[PDB]
Design a protein around this motif. Sequence first.
Motif, PDB file in Angstrom:
ATOM      1  N   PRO A 145       3.819  -3.296   3.641  1.00  0.00           N
ATOM      2  CA  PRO A 145       4.292  -2.315   3.434  1.00  0.00           C
ATOM      3  C   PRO A 145       4.840  -1.860   2.211  1.00  0.00           C
ATOM      4  N   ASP A 146       4.787  -0.574   2.085  1.00  0.00           N
ATOM      5  CA  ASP A 146       5.352   0.130   0.803  1.00  0.00           C
ATOM      6  C   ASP A 146       5.782   1.375   0.695  1.00  0.00           C
TER       7      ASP A 146
ATOM      8  N   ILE B 292       0.759  -1.197  -0.090  1.00  0.00           N
ATOM      9  CA  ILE B 292       0.125  -0.143   0.127  1.00  0.00           C
ATOM     10  C   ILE B 292       0.820   0.961   0.079  1.00  0.00           C
ATOM     11  N   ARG B 293       0.618   2.004  -0.813  1.00  0.00           N
ATOM     12  CA  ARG B 293       1.539   3.353  -1.048  1.00  0.00           C
ATOM     13  C   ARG B 293       0.578   4.619  -0.615  1.00  0.00           C
ATOM     14  N   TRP B 294       1.335   5.394   0.037  1.00  0.00           N
ATOM     15  CA  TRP B 294       0.606   6.601   0.475  1.00  0.00           C
ATOM     16  C   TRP B 294       1.334   7.866  -0.066  1.00  0.00           C
TER      17      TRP B 294
ATOM     18  N   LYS C 214      -2.283  -4.712  -5.259  1.00  0.00           N
ATOM     19  CA  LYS C 214      -1.865  -3.319  -5.158  1.00  0.00           C
ATOM     20  C   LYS C 214      -2.858  -2.522  -4.578  1.00  0.00           C
ATOM     21  N   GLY C 215      -2.459  -1.615  -3.678  1.00  0.00           N
ATOM     22  CA  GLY C 215      -3.181  -0.653  -3.066  1.00  0.00           C
ATOM     23  C   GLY C 215      -2.649   0.682  -3.087  1.00  0.00           C
ATOM     24  N   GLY C 216      -3.411   1.853  -2.681  1.00  0.00           N
ATOM     25  CA  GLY C 216      -2.625   3.097  -2.691  1.00  0.00           C
ATOM     26  C   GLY C 216      -3.904   4.038  -2.134  1.00  0.00           C
ATOM     27  N   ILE C 217      -3.164   5.200  -1.566  1.00  0.00           N
ATOM     28  CA  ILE C 217      -4.317   6.348  -1.165  1.00  0.00           C
ATOM     29  C   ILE C 217      -3.429   7.608  -1.632  1.00  0.00           C
ATOM     30  N   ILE C 218      -4.310   8.290  -2.151  1.00  0.00           N
ATOM     31  CA  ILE C 218      -3.617   9.623  -2.649  1.00  0.00           C
ATOM     32  C   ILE C 218      -3.635  10.467  -1.572  1.00  0.00           C
TER      33      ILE C 218
ATOM     34  N   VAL D  61      -1.217   2.130  -9.926  1.00  0.00           N
ATOM     35  CA  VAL D  61      -1.438   1.123  -8.753  1.00  0.00           C
ATOM     36  C   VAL D  61      -1.641  -0.247  -9.756  1.00  0.00           C
ATOM     37  N   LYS D  62      -2.364  -0.027 -11.005  1.00  0.00           N
ATOM     38  CA  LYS D  62      -2.549  -1.036 -11.873  1.00  0.00           C
ATOM     39  C   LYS D  62      -1.084  -1.642 -12.322  1.00  0.00           C
ATOM     40  N   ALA D  63      -0.385  -0.862 -12.910  1.00  0.00           N
ATOM     41  CA  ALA D  63       0.794  -1.453 -13.198  1.00  0.00           C
ATOM     42  C   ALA D  63       1.581  -2.049 -12.068  1.00  0.00           C
TER      43      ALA D  63
END
Length: 416
Positions: A141-142, A69-71, A102-106, A80-82
Amino acid sequence: IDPFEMAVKQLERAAQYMDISEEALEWLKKPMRIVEVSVPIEMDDGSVKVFTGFRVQHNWARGPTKGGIRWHPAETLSTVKALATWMTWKVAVVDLPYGGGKGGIIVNPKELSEREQERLARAYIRAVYDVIGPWTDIPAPDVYTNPKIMGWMMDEYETIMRRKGPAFGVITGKPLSIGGSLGRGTATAQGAIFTIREAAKALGIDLKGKKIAVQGYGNAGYYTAKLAKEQLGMTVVAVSDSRGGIYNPDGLDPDEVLKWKREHGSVKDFPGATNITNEELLELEVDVLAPAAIEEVITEKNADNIKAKIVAEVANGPVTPEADDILREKGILQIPDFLCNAGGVTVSYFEWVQNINGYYWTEEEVREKLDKKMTKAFWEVYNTHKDKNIHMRDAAYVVAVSRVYQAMKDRGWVKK
């Protein structure tokens, strides 16, 4: 240039080197599930702000999906898709029972408070609970995210799930006190060292007394240099950071280098070490070069000047395809970027296995299992390299896509 298009182009490039049906390629070009949710949190000033969260599950033919997950304020759905697509091949090349996720928050976490970060993690879990689980999707973690956020996320998931199963195994990278695993800190560097040792063994060379140069002195490069010196007996002669780099033929001890960096601000002005820039370090004549820093660092401009016999792509894509072809023409053995740094996901899989089983291993067991996995994966990739007379990167892509395609065919998803 969109990242998902870059990943799809890479996948097609890989597919034109192997026998894969058109329907399977079209299936692999599309993520199987994409979830975009709003993440509302209460700020310390009392207001409520809504963030954009993502959770992409590219493919789960081989098992539950895996991914961090990226912040990051620059997060987009394409990135995220890539990264989920890349994670699919990353977990496939190591032969793990995992898919791609994959996950992420802007969000910019630098301006968020401790409490606000905890609220953000808990709200993200509350938003994506319906698509994650110990056997469905395991976050990790990311970038800009730490094991503390993992512990918060696991606690929120356990609270929602009402302790009806292995809530420890829903997420990896947790602190040791709560379902954590030993050897997580040095996972990527340990995998890189094992791949370097196997590559040197295949090339018929001895690491004892060989020079190594590492670009980037973060958490992956410093451990890489350290474990290289201990396990491989290699002489670390050059290290570098974003600000600058240093070089000393006799050998560098990474411990005081890191101390100095965490006391001065950068890895420079070392006693007896010549101050050099990243490009001079890259073109320096060594036996192993390990770029562990910002991506796209070896381009067609400096590809010819590289003199390292082994290039270990610890970082995510530091070599352009043209520079990659040039290095191949020069007899330089390149370890694929998503094969060299596969130790982290392997140790994450080990942590998930420990959480699921309820039994936890020691440092030696984790280290030996990681060694076995990395050795087998690297020899598989190298054997494909020699059999198909294609690029090492292409060989790794062929192995990963072949495993995923076989898993898809066995499930009956694709009829050809």
